[PDB]
Every structure is written in C-alpha cells, then in structure tokens.
Design a protein around this ligand. Structure first.
Ligand SMILES: CS(=O)(=O)Nc1cccc(Nc2nccc(Nc3c(Cl)ccc4c3OCO4)n2)c1
Ligand SMILES: [Mg+2]
Ligand SMILES: [Mg+2]
Ligand SMILES: [Mg+2]
Length: 274
C-alpha cells in the first residue's frame, strides 16, 4: 500500500537499521483515526538492488496478518526518502527490554511473552515461511508487553550464495541448518529454544563468550545451554526438546504453544526449579 507522504509525520529517531534510521511517527489517512507508526527510511546513496532488498521486507510483511507478527501499514516509494511504515512497538527489542528490566517481570509474564512469540511462529510455519533469524533481538514488544516477530527477508545468507541476507547467525541456528543450509520450520524450533533461554535469562547472550566455532563443536558434542537462574524446569525441558539433534523429534509450533498454554493454566507446575 502506497502511502501519500502528506499522511506521515516523523517525530523522533529511535533506532538504526541495516539501511538507515528507524523513527517513531504518526500516520493519518482520510477516513481513519491517527495512529502511531514506526518508520524505516532509506535515503540517497543506495543501489537499486539495495532498494529492492529494503522494500522486500515490506512485501513479505504485507503477506501476513496476525497479532504476533509486526503489521505493515504501507510504504512510501514515489518520493524520497523511501519509507516502510509499521505498527509501533513502544518497548523495542525484547533482549534489550529484558536487560533493562532484569528480574522485574514474573515467570508468568515471561511465559506469556514466549507464548506470543510461539503463536507468531505457529502462524509463519502454517504459511510455510521459514524465518531463519529467530532471536530475541528480532522480537518487538508493545506497551502491553505483547511480543511480535519481526525481520522479514528471503535473501540467502552469504554462506549460501556465490563462492566469492548477511552471515548465518550461528548461535541461534540448528546444527543441520549450519552444516547443510537446510532451513526449515524445525530449524526455527531450535532457534525458538534459544529465544526461550534468552527470555528466561533476561537477555543474556547465548553461549556467553564462546566462539561461533566453539558453539558448533559443543552442540555436536552434546552440550546444551543450562537452565538460567530461577528457570522452571518444565521450561528448560521444553528448551531441550527444541534442541534435539534430530529435527524430526523437535516439537512443532502448535505443540509449543500448547505446552506454554498448559503452563499458564497450571502455574503451580512452574514452581519446580533446579
Ligand atoms: C529495535 S530498533 O528498531 O533498533 N529500535 C526501536 C526502539 C524502540 C522502539 C522501536 N519500535 C519499533 N516498532 C515497530 C517497528 C520497529 N522497527 C522496524 C522493524 Cl524491526 C522492521 C521494519 C520496520 C520497522 O519500523 C518500520 O519498518 N521498531 C524500535
Ligand atoms: Mg532474517
Ligand atoms: Mg536478520
Ligand atoms: Mg541474570
């Protein structure tokens, strides 16, 4: 949807993306109430390939409609700068939000967040969309603590293409996806287990200071991240399930959502910690 630039007001720069700024703003279109939006801008200096890559995120977002997937409002393409407008998520990236709020949200709240992410992923997998970069940094959080999946793009990672989408995010990526580049919803399930660990650790870095190669070797040699401090054993077990070496043994996203829904209905169960 092409948005007339007169309908957009940019209010403040709130972040930086791959190709430019991220801004908070307001969108007011004839017949609709004004709404808050996030705005990604692409200014001069870019190649047309880069413009197409930039705008591909909007095309993909535009294919989706789900309360746990960032909603596209529109694009500005017939003017400079080129812009992508989405709903506004007041609290930004989940990893930094949790680090700011370390130890300040209850287990039930954290499970709620995890459930929102898992529902987003359930939807993507139902749509045969493989995310490939599922990580807490790609989850955005609104004022009501609703978590939504972001970061959409279909470009191969650098390891896939010519001998001579960026690099594979090793610490989030399933071992078969690293080894063979086979990215599937089951490799996303692996990544989701890592997101779980990030959330329950209030945004610690997966594998701390281990090198990418150390992580790869450790996983092959059966190492798995330990439960974070105070983490319910049932959540850590779900993480381990997500991290099965055999991709076919990992839970699919409907089963993940079901498991989390049971926890929420049975919060006593979350009292058992190591
Ligand atoms: C995490 S940040 O973007 O570096 N900083 C930030 C800080 C506070 C709130 C938001 N909030 C926020 N809310 C919604 C989206 C985004 N970023 C974003 C993404 Cl992720 C993808 C595509 C588009 C946008 O904006 C428009 O197009 N941000 C972002
Ligand atoms: Mg991506
Ligand atoms: Mg990415
Ligand atoms: Mg801590």
């Amino acid at each position: 949807k092409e948005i007339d630039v007169s309908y957009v007001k940019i209010e403040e720069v709130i972040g930086a993306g791959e190709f430019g700024e991220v801004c908070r703003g307001r969108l007011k279109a004839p017949g609709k109430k004004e709404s808050c939006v996030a705005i990604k801008t692409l200014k001069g200096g870019y190649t047309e390939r880069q413009r197409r890559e930039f705008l591909s995120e909007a095309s993909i977002m535009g294919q989706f409609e789900h309360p746990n997937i960032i909603r596209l409002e529109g694009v500005v393409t017939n003017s400079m700068p080129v812009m992508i407008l989405t709903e506004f998520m007041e609290n930004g990236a989940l990893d930094s939000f949790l680090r700011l709020n370390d130890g300040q949200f209850t287990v039930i709240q954290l499970v709620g967040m995890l459930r929102g992410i898992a529902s987003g992923m359930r939807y993507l997998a139902e749509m045969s969309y493989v995310h490939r970069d599922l990580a807490a940094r790609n989850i955005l959080v609104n004022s009501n603590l609703v978590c939504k999946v972001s970061d959409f793009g279909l470009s191969r990672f650098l390891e896939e293409n010519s001998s001579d989408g960026g690099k594979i995010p090793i610490r989030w990526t399933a071992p078969e996806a690293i080894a063979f580049r086979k990215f599937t919803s089951a490799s996303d399930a692996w990544s989701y287990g890592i997101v779980m660990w990030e959330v329950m650790s209030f945004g610690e870095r997966p594998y701390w200071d281990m090198s990418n190669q150390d992580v790869i070797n450790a996983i092959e040699q059966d190492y798995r991240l330990p439960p974070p401090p105070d983490c319910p054993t049932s959540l850590h077990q779900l993480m381990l399930d997500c991290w099965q070496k055999d991709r076919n043994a990992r839970p699919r996203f409907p089963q993940v959502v079901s498991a989390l829904d049971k926890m929420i209905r049975n919060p006593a169960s979350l009292k058992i910690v190591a």
